[PDB]
């Protein structure tokens, strides 16, 4: 699982 939305840190959801 990843998220295309760029966030300060990724892959935390």
């Amino acid at each position, epitope marked *: 699982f*990843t*998220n*295309k939305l*760029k966030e*300060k*840190h990724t*892959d*935390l959801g």
Partner: antibody
Amino acid sequence: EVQLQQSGPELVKPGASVKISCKTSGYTFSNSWMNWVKQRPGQGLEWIGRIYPGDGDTNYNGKFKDKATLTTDKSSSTAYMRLSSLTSVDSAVYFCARSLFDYWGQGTTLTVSS
Amino acid sequence: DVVMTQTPLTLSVTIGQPASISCKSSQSLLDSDGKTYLIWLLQRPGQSPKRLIYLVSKLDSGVPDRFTGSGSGTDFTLKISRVEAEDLGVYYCCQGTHFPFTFGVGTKLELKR
């Protein structure tokens, strides 16, 4: 599974440059930050900087700003770090590490020596 | 930079016994977005670090239930309810709230027998 596969060990002369690679698989490369980390006995673990492959955004540690350049090749899902003007203090193990340091490469040993 | 001060530096413990490591940051790790970007890593010898705990208290996949994390602000703790033989290595706290991201010096966990 997420895999980070780094290039092999390097011996380089003082003053030279080297480029280390981190080939990824198992996730959409464009959607995760990629960090680079230095490990040297003595200095501990040090964060060099990171790059967001989706748009090439980079953040550098000021300590490494004049030393390191981070790039990505989206076509091969590979991240690269070039280190220049090498001196003996740059001898270390370098790791790539994804996102909030959740997956790590196996490390690349760099020795700077004549 | 944010300094990450871990204690103790060495942890000598007998199998089946509880243990804990604390981490102090020189600035609060509470981010403006409400998250606290504090993680714990374990590195065995000649191996790469592996993340165990993230966002202070969340366990990564496959990490045994014996591991817990707690804390807020500048002060954090990694707790092991019972140390097993395979827990040995160097534990690091690491913060990703402030640039540059920084690591603690590491705590070596060694086992008595």
